[PDB]
Symmetry: none
Subunit: 132 residues, 3 copies
């Protein structure tokens, strides 16, 4: 409904899904968890299934951003793999091992953050001096 | 009170400044323009001045994202160098040359995008099935 | 001399220098150690002094390559900061924090690898089928 339209809504697609939770950190957005173990060998792609479906809150242009210690920590690209406001598929996170050692994902690991960008950018107004 | 806070407000700090404009592309946010010429030799950091001050719209956690063929074409890191909504400083964009050829910035070049992330992430609601 | 010309030669510029040692890993080259503590705040450059001078072995086009868990592990660019066969300065390693948390270097930390590329690339020969 129009009040739950303001909220992040999700449904579980299996017993293995972890509820997205709000991250602690400033601008963390929502934490995404793997539902499965994966071994991502060097120079290989991988689609990490969360086994959740999600309806983004209103105002939200959804972007999958790296865990943090992940884009860095194990030499892994994490696809922005942007999310439509009407995408109801199993939410997957694309990982590419660009490193020389295999990367390990376990069931229940935090794999990414779901960030919200603005849908509509307001028009620009010029002034002479900015009054705080 | 806050009647103009809807909008991106800016002021010029010199005649060399270009008005931020809304970018064309989906999720481009606002175009940021260099007010000066810069030569950025390999292994060097540079702080590119826009000679504008900015007050972000309501709801906006401001992030400096690269121009698409910038972090790409000329091997340039662009620090998220996020913008506080109490920051009336000259908006600078941090560049680092990580390539073996120098990167050339001219006065009036587009050097970055100003992206808006959500300020407050609504809490999560579980349902059994979304699409119905 | 012409026999030590084949070796990696180094001299200490201070009591704080750690002798380059051959790395364990395949294609590790030579380990480089910081002689000092550094705090590299987000979006900042840093030149990490080894307090050694080095004469590369003959055949060797010297390249500074990341520690490994460094280019990745703490979101740090490590400049190729290539080394001339007649560069006798204090060997420094350029780090750029492109992450959101400060990176910490302690005296004696491994900061990079010194890799040797080939000086002269042999001409190409075509055959019909490659006999191992």
């Amino acid at each position: 409904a129009e009040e739950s339209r303001k909220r992040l809504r999700f449904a579980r697609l299996s017993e293995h899904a972890t509820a997205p939770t709000k991250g602690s950190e400033r601008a963390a957005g929502y934490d995404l968890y793997s539902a499965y173990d994966y071994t991502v060998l060097p120079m290989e792609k991988a689609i990490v299934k969360t086994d959740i479906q999600i309806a983004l809150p209103s105002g939200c242009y959804g972007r999958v951003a790296p865990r943090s210690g992940l884009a860095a920590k194990h030499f892994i690209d994490v696809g922005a793999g942007v999310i439509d406001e009407d995408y109801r598929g199993n939410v997957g996170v694309v990982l590419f091992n660009f490193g020389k050692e295999k990367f390990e994902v376990k069931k229940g690991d935090r794999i990414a953050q779901l960030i919200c960008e603005r849908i509509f950018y307001p028009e620009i107004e010029e002034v002479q001096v900015l009054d705080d």
